[PDB]
Structure formats: C-alpha cells, structure tokens
Design a binder for this molecule. Sequence first.
Ligand code: SF4
Ligand code: SF4
Ligand code: SF4
Lengths: 176, 97, 206, 70, 314, 169, 156, 110
Amino acid sequence: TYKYVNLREPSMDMKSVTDRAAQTLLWTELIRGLGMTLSYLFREPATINYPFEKGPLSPRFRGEHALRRYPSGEERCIACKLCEAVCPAQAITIEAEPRADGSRRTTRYDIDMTKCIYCGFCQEACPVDAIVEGPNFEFSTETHEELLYNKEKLLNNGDKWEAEIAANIQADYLYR
Amino acid sequence: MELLQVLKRGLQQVSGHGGLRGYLRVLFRANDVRVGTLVGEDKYGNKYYEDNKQFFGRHRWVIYTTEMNGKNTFWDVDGSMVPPEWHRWLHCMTDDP
Amino acid sequence: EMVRKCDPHIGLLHRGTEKLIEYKTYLQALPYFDRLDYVSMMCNEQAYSLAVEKLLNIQPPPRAQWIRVLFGEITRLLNHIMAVTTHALDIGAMTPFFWMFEEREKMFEFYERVSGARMHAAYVRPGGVHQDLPLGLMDDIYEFSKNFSLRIDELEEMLTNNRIWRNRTVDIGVVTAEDALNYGFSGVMLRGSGIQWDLRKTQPYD
Amino acid sequence: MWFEVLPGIAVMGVCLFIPGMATARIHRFSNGGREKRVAHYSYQWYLMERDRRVSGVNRYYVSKGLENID
Amino acid sequence: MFMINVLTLIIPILLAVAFLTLVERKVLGYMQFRKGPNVVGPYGLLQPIADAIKLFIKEPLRPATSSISMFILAPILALTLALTMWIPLPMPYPLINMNLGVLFMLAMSSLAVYSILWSGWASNSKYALIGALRAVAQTISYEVTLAIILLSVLLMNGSFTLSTLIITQEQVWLIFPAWPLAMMWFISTLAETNRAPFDLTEGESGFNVEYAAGPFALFFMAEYANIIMMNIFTTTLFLGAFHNPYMPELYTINFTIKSLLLSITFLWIRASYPRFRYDQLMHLLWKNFLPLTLALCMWHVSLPILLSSIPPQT
Amino acid sequence: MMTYIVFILSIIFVMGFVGFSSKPSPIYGGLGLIVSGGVGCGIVLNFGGSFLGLMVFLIYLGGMMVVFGYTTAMATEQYNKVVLGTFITGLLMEFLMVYYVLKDKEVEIVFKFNGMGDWVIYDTGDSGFFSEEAMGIAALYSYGTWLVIVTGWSLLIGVVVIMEITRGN
Amino acid sequence: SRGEYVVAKLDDLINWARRSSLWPMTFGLACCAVEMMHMAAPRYDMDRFGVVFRASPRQSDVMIVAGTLTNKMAPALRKVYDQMPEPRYVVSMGSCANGGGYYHYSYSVVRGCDRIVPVDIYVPGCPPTAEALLYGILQLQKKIKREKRLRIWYRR
Amino acid sequence: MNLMITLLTNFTLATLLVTIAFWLPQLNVYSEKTSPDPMGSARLPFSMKFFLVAITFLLFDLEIALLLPLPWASQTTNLNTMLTMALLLIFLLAVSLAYEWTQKGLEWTE
Ligand code: SF4
Ligand code: SF4
Ligand code: SF4
C-alpha cells in the first residue's frame, strides 16, 4: 500500500553506463523535451475569441442579484427578512412598512455588491423565490456607488433578465 | 497531394462572407474568419452562428451589429450587447435557440 | 551568496477569520473555509463539516460520502497542479505552467456545474451536500479523466529526466525523520522523509 | 492552426533581406556595373591607384582595355 | 551614396528587433498552447508600433542619480555598440570590408560590458551593483571562452577576413569537421546574450532596475540587436551558404533562411529549460567548458600541419 | 585641417589625459582615460596599424580596464577646487603650446620640435600581398622562442602570485 | 479648424497606442490572483489583447489589486503605486479590494482599496470570473479610448 | 573616413533616441515624485571571489592575446618551432587552469 518513488537502483553494466554517458553528452532527454515542445507547437490552441465567443457555464450560475415578479405584475418579495438574516456578509438591508392596500411589501431593499460574496444563501433562503442570483456577470462599474444597489436597480435588473431567469429556474428547480 | 484541400477550404472561407470585402470586414472587426451555419439574428442586428465541428467553446459565436441604441459600434463591441434570449444560447445555458 | 538565518515575516494577509466566526452562525461560517486555502477550496469544507457532524452526532447519507471523496480528490488535482507548476515557474521553466492550466480550467467547469461557482462553491455542508450532481455530469467526468493520464506523463517528461531541473532539486531541502516529527510537519514532509504516515489510511474518514 | 505566425516570419525575412540586396545594388551601381574593388593589401591598392591614374577620368570603374594602346 | 547604405543598414535593424519582440511573443504564446497578439491588426502586425509609441510617451522612474552624465552615457553606448557592430557582415558583401572584421566584432563584444557596469554605477542601490558585478563576471568569463572558440575557428580558416570565410565554406560546411566546437559555440551564443536557461538578470533583480523606461527600452533593443547579430554570425560562419559572384540574392535568401530558423531555435531553447544558478554556470565553464575547449584548440592547431591542409593567408 | 587628423587626435589625446590628470574620483578618471585610450587607438589606426589598434581595443580597453572598473566598484562609495585649478592650468599650457606649434611651427622644450603636419614621413612603397605588421606579429612563433618562454613563465608566476598573496594566510 | 482636427487625430493615435499595449502589475495577494492566473490560461489568453503577463512594477501601465488589502500591506501598496510611472490606472478585483467584502467589519482589513489609491474600474465578484475581468479590461480600454488630453491641452 | 562617417551617424542616432526618451516626455505635466532595496544601512560587502575571478579573467585574456596570431603565423617556414611553441603555450594555459583549480580557486563560486 506504499510505493518507493525514487528508489530505482541504476544498472552498473557497460550498456547502461555508456547510454547514460551518451545522454549526458548528446543531451538526449533535452532532445526529448525539444520534441515534446515541437509536438505541442502544432496543436490547435484553445483560445476562445472573447467577446465574440463565451465560456461554457451552467444554469446554476451565481451572478448579479435581481428581484423577480409574479406572472401578474406584483413584486414577489413579502419583506420577510430571511435573506438579510442569512447573509454572511450583511450586504442586505431591509426596511419595510405596510403599504396602501395593506400588503406586506418592502420600502428599502439594499444589496451592497461590494460587500456580497456571491454565496447564494439569499436565493435559497427566500421562500417565494423573490431574490435570485441571476446569470449576469458583465456589470463592472467605473464608480464605487454604482455597485451599491437599491430596490429600484434590483427591480430593473429583474425586469431586464426575467426572460432568462424564469427559464433557468424552470430548468433547475427540480434539483432544489 | 493534400495541400489543395486546405487551399480550397481557405478559398471557401474567403468566398463565404460575400466576397473579399466582407472577408476583410469580418477579419478587421472580429479577428476570426471561419464560416458556420447562421442560427439567427435578433432585432438589434446581432447575427448568431453555430459550427458543431469545432471544439467546445468555439462552436457557437456572434457577430455584433453596427448600431445598437444609437451608438456607433463599428469597432466598440461589448460583452453585455447580447439580449437574454440569446444570452442563454451563447453561454451554453441550453441547446435551443 | 549563502544563508545562516532566514526569518520570514507574515501577517500581510491577516484578515482575522477565526474571530469573525464567533459572531456568525455555523452555516454562515461555512464560506469562510473556502477562502482560507484558495487552491484546496473543496477540501477545507470537508474538514469543517466533519467537525460539526462530530458534535451533532449525525452522519451524512451514503451518496453524500462518495461525492465528498470524489470532489475532494478532484481538488487534489486542483492543488498539486498549483504545487509543481508554480514551483517550476519560480525556478524558471514556464512551459508546462500553461499546459496544465487548460486542464485546471476544465475542472473549474465541474465546480461551476454542480454548485454554481468556479472557486468558492460553498457546496459541502454539515449533514451532506447542498445540491445533487446535474444529470450527465459524471459522464463528463469520465471522458475528461480518461485523457488526463497523458497530461501527467506530459508534465513528467520535461521535468523528471531534465538535468537542469535535477541540479536545482536533488540536494536542496533535506530533512531527517526525527526533526520532521518534532517540527509539526505533515503530508509530503513526513512522506518525503520516509515516514509512513497518511491520514487516509490510518484514521480514515467518510 | 500552425500557419498563423508565418506572416511575422515573412516580415522578418523581408526586413533581413532588404539591406543585403540594397548594398549589393548600391555596390553594383556605384562601381560602374562592377563589384567594389577590395584592398586588403598594399599591392591591390597600388593597382587601384594605377587604374585611377591610367583611366584619365579619376574614376577607376571606367576601365581602359586593349583599344587604348596602339 | 554611402549614407543611403548606412541608413538602409541601421533602420531595418530597429525594425528587425521590434519584430523580434513581436515574433518571440507569438512564438512563446504558441509554444505554450495559447495565442499571441492578434487583436490590434491582421495577425498582430501593428503591435510593435503600439509598443514603440507607448514606450516613447511614458513617464520616467525618477532615480536618485549619483552621476547624471554616466546615466545618460550608458544607453547611448549600449545602442552604439549594438548598432554600429553590424558593419563587417558579408551579405554577400560587407558595408565596410576589414581584414580584421572578426577581431573588430570580438573587441567590441568584449567591451560591451561597460554599459552594464555604468548601469550598475548609476543606480545607488547596492543590490543592483551586486547584480551588475555578477553579470559582468559571467559575461567576461563567457567572452574568454568565445575568444578561444573563435580563435580555433579562424585558425581553421587561416585568415581574419570575414569575406574569405564564405569562400572557405564552399565545398562543405564548417559544422561538419568542427561539430564539437559547434556545440560549444551554440551554448556560448545561448549564454552570452544574458538568456534563459542562464538568465540571472531576472531571477533573485536586474542591472537596470532604477533606470527609466526609455533607457530600459534602449537596453532591450540593444540586447536583441546583439542577439540577431550573433545569430547571423553563427549562420554565416558555421552554415555558410552558396554564393554566386553574379547571382548574389540566392545567397542572401539562403542565409536569411538559416538566420530565421536559428532565431526560431533560440526561441525554442529559451522556452524549454528552467533557469540555472550562478555557481552552476560558473562550474559549467570553469570546470567543464574550458578544458574541453583548450583540447579542441590544441587539436585544431595541430591538425592542418599533420594533414598538409594549412589554409592560405590570402 | 583634415590632413593633420592624427595631430588633432593627438591634441584630443592630451586632452584625454587631462580628463583624468586632476583625479577627482576614480570612476570619472577611468571614463576619461577610456576616452583617451579610444582616441590614442584612433591615432594608431590612422598610421595603418590595424592589428595593434585592435590589440588596444580588445585587451587594454575591453579586457583590463573592465577589471579596473570592477575593482573600483568594490570601493569608492557613492554620494574639487584645486582639481579645477589644475584643470585650467593644464588647459592654458595645452592651448599655449597649441598656438606655439600653430604659429611658430617650431618649439624647444627638451629638443627641437617642428609644428608642420605629419603627412610628410609616410611611405609610398608597397609591401606586396601582405600587411607588414601582420606578419611582423606572426613572426613571434617562428623567431621569438625565448621571449615567448619568459612571457608564459611570467604570466604563470603572476597566477601563482594571485593565488598566494591574496590567500590571506 | 486645422488645429482641433490635427490634435484630435494625434489624440486618437496616441490613445490607440496606449490602450493597445496595457502592461499590468499583478498583486498576488489572495484568491482573485489565482483567478487572474486562470484568466492568463490559454483559454482566455490576455496576451492577444496586447496585455503581457507579469511585468515589472517599474514599467507597468495598470495595476490590478486582487485580494484583501490589510493594514500591514497598505503602505507597501501605496509605495508601489507611487513608484509606477504616469499614466497609471487601477483595476479592482473582487469584493475585498472593492469594499472589503466578507471582511468589511474585520479589525485589520482596509474597507476598500479606494482609501489608499484612486481606482478606475471596479470588477465585482468573489472571485469575479476570468471573462468578467476580461470585460473589465476591455472597459478600461474603452475608457482610455475616449480620453481627450490633447484637445483639452489645445483648448486651455 | 567612411567608417568614421558611419560611427558618427550611429552615435548621433543614439543621441537622438536618448533625447527623445529623456526630453520629449517633459512636455507633459503629470506630477512631481517626492518619493520618501534590501540594503538598509550596511556597507557593501567585499565578496573576494568576484575580484579573484575578474583578475583570473584578466590574466587569461592577456595570454589569449599572446595566443592570438596563429592564423597569420601558420604560413611561416619553420613549422616545427611554431608547433612546439603553440602546444607549449596551450599547455601553459592548462597548467595555470590546473593550479587555479587546486588552490581552492574554484570553490564557493565554482
Ligand atoms: S449571495 Fe450570500 S453574501 Fe451575497 S447577498 Fe446573498 S446571502 Fe449575502
Ligand atoms: S427572503 Fe425573499 S421574501 Fe424574504 S425579505 Fe428576502 S427577498 Fe423578501
Ligand atoms: S473577493 Fe473573494 S475570491 Fe477575491 S480575494 Fe476576496 S475572498 Fe478571495
């Protein structure tokens, strides 16, 4: 159950000694390395042409946060504050009040994307699938405050990406 | 001989883009001149192509439009220039365009 | 050119991880173990989840035990590629550094498919795993693992029999068996010096 | 595909090929359709100066042949 | 009409070293399964132009110069010794024909270490001075072994003139009866240019760490000019091609081809071997290269007398 | 002006010596004497001595004053009036002798010296198919037996001296 | 007029020259440095963009802060940024260099590398994917592409 | 004079390059670097092996210059004396190398 690596006794005969001398003088293993490099020169490189080509990703991909909606126009979140309680980085701040029709809805849903570690605890703790770690990843910003999302930016992200977040969650929800 | 087949493949690469003008256009705008089956296009003008013989990662690609939301994007292409319905197919979420 | 005293200074990356655990719950402290050793990301959670399950007096289901070993062993291919190739990068042979990174990019897709993140998966949890493997994942593992035996022989060809690699390596860094045990060494340190000690054979887990 | 670095090799080739052809053409044009008369020893230089004196032009590459004598 | 020839020699040198950088970049890319620059233009043709214009508008590093005059003089001397040294190469006729052209190149290659010494002296950091001293010691020793090898080569040739060496290599190449000298010259051309696997100018601190980016670019162009010079010198003197006195461009094309494959071999070797140590290559010359080189010199100075093959002086 | 080129270089040669005559610092003195060695080798080369000039370049400049710079780099840690005064004194003496040899064309310091250009003492003869100094150097291995013997013995003894007196014990 | 058109042409020429050869200085601190090295893999291949790999910090044009910037490292990072010649750009990898991220409330973690150096491009993630940093680098190239140094110099 | 013309042209082109690299970027108004190495305050150590190998290089180069004129000398009439002299000189080089080997010269910088 244990093997002795680097415990091979070299042969002391004239054949192996002369072959090792020829390896030392003629650089035979160096020639082998040259041949390997030549063989690996002619292969087709694996360089994908970004941004005209994109890398392979899964439907479970964790990216930009978004707030979803029901298929009737009403926002999915009910201000239950599970995501801000489960968040390991405390990037989610929720302030709520009963609105005009008496529904329990959020008034402030802030996600600090510079604080968030993209762990996906909010997308699994949410009992109504309101917050989703969406598929977007190309949202690098030039200014720090543009990464401090309020409720309106998250709702705009949800309205923008719902046409693919719904398909992803439809393809994925049977594993959850 | 064998090199005749490679030369004919290069000639069909040149002639498949609607001539030498289109060949140099896609060469200077995308740095890749290989041909493929036109999967489709969106409203903004981005064309989407598939070539299953290539290795994984390079089999699906997109040629971007020259104008999207009023921006002259002849040279300035962006990774976020893809609508979500094509963002599924491009990043290999699913096999159905 | 020679050395009698070499005093390293550490603390340039002191985040204070083990204090922040005290103010968070057990499930909230799980992503902290991902970021301790960021080339053995999926192996550290197996150590943390084994600690919680020992206290909780529960055991994972039999399917979860085989997944943690399978993805634990794929992380050994993650880490040891970083071990040899960056050691070759520091010495000077930059050629196999880019050869194995395409392979390391291929097993990054396996991390992204089952959990959703390339590096910090937060997959292994106390009590099992968070999600099951997607359908057809293990078919993609076998087709990759069939062709991976050539890459190790590809890497071994340019380094093991190279006389330049040997002359930098064969007589620098020699320990004895007794002082390795007294220095708190483990892993390849004890195995390299000839001491027969492996935790997977003497005190096994799942 | 291995046939993509060869434009750089061809640019290297034309860059290393231009100065030799240029100096060969300049040598052939300047020396009257002939090579440059090298002078590694003083006897060759003395014959060079003899040619320059004999030619009557103070340019040796307009050489005078058999027709110059009677 | 001479200054036109001088300009057509010195401007393609700069173009050739810029395309050395570009070709080396895509070759090291393709050697290691990745790709080189291909975004800027067609197959990355406009990359060296971007490199030059970037390096000609940047800010300097602002070092505490102990000697401003020496700091100015070091890159001028480096570029001069790299650029004016290309003259006596016979392709197929040299720009300036010397009877002692090989001695001329050898003397200026021996004195080329003054740029490294002045770069070490201009920087007030003592570790840079230590690295400069180590590089100078390596270069002067390796110039010793170059001097012995070249002495053997032109005593085989018998005359110091570089143009007669083409006539010497007409029937057979010099690599056939001087193959061990060929291998020692190949290690010497690999090693004299401060190149991997003996590149101690990068591993542990360069000899121009406090120098500005402009002088650093000048040093790099000078080093690459020396690389192409000695590659072409090896091509001419060990692999002499057929030269028709009426049809010269076949010889120009032929030695251009050998120069290009020898430069490709340089980029090949630099991408296959890990770096050595200082004492390792000092041991390589002072205990392994020097006695074999001396024995080869003894054998090659004893051979033509016993073979009735003493070559002509003229 | 051109025909006195060696003389002009000779003037620069004297200037080069002044460039390290005051000796303000060993590194600047080494640089000035490097420049003086270059112009003195140009003086040698303009007389037809290519081999001796490249002996000066290869050995004196590129192989030995490199060692001088290497040694002086081991001391003289990085960071005068009478230096500058001696510089102006040497400048005044140099220029005064320049006007002396450019106006009188004759001077007396130790012997009678002429100021006329040196292009009158060369030779119009031909050595044939060989440089005279080339086979002059080449005659060392056929005639100079005792000189080569003592040169090799002295250089080996210098190696002995370097091994012994720098051992320190 | 002639002058504005000429300085515009020269501005876009030097702008293309600067944006096509961005030489970086990688700060190998933490996880995001390993993600940068995997962006340097043959699949993503930064080197086709004119971006060399692992340049010296005395000649680099851009700096990518990848990892956690603690209190013990901030003077060293400020010294490195001050040593790097003009023009200099800073790209922030990860949540650590953006706002601290996981360790925002730790006692010995600087809450964002913006407090030490000016930061141009913020790349979000933990770690951000390799193609996300590639898009951020292209965004930095486009930010350089619209610079107006010579036009402002002529107008002033 | 053509050689000196080439040397002057090359040196002036190098001067133009260093003038572009030194004074052309001074038009920009970027910043002034106040800027307030492993060498803390200790004096530079005198590593004697470097000086020893430098003077060994000097002696070997000097007698290499002695060894030089063999290609010109090979046409001499007295070939036996030349052969004896050249073999004995290279033997002297071998003997000096052997002595530099024996008396601890090639150790700690091999
Ligand atoms: S992914 Fe994790 S760290 Fe980010 S907001 Fe959700 S719970 Fe918080
Ligand atoms: S867990 Fe879901 S429903 Fe509850 S507060 Fe968060 S987003 Fe709203
Ligand atoms: S942002 Fe996340 S992945 Fe990047 S260094 Fe910080 S903990 Fe690691």
